[PDB]
Design a protein around this ligand. Structure first.
Ligand SMILES: [Zn+2]
Ligand SMILES: [Zn+2]
Lengths: 69, 69
């Protein structure tokens, strides 16, 4: 684990949980797979720029299923 | 139907958590219940939590009896 990497991972969680659009959180809470590329764009629209690597590692660490994986 | 944590109405088209024990049947928004179960700000998916009505400690999945069917 890295303290600084987890700060960016925390920002992704905060967007998921704080966005008016709760559809991503509802997918996670119902064990429905997320399209990582679509998610990256969704995050970008919420003022959050993150890489696909950051998203994949976030999903792996916090229990989010990825389409194709 | 009223969410038992935020007191807003739960629409007919909306997914909702319920305690799987009929003797309790605590009903609430998925996001509301999940938020009440989370222990740290980076987390998005509850593992387990205590039903606030009956006090049983159950895994997240147990609250999803109506979500998939
Ligand atoms: Zn609620
Ligand atoms: Zn209960």
């Amino acid at each position: 684990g890295s303290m600084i990497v987890t700060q960016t991972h925390r920002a992704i969680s905060q967007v998921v949980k704080q966005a008016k659009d709760n559809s991503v959180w509802i997918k996670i809470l119902t064990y429905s797979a997320i399209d990582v590329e679509e998610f990256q764009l969704w995050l970008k629209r919420k003022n959050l720029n993150v890489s696909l690597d950051l998203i994949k590692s976030w999903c792996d660490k916090y229990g989010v299923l990825m389409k194709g994986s | 139907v009223k969410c038992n944590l935020c007191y807003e109405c739960i629409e007919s088209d909306e997914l909702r958590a319920n305690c799987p024990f009929t003797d309790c049947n605590s009903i609430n928004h998925l996001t509301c219940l999940a938020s009440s179960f989370l222990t740290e700000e980076c987390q998005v998916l509850p593992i387990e939590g205590m039903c606030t009505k009956c006090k049983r400690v159950l895994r997240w999945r147990e609250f999803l009896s109506t979500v998939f069917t």
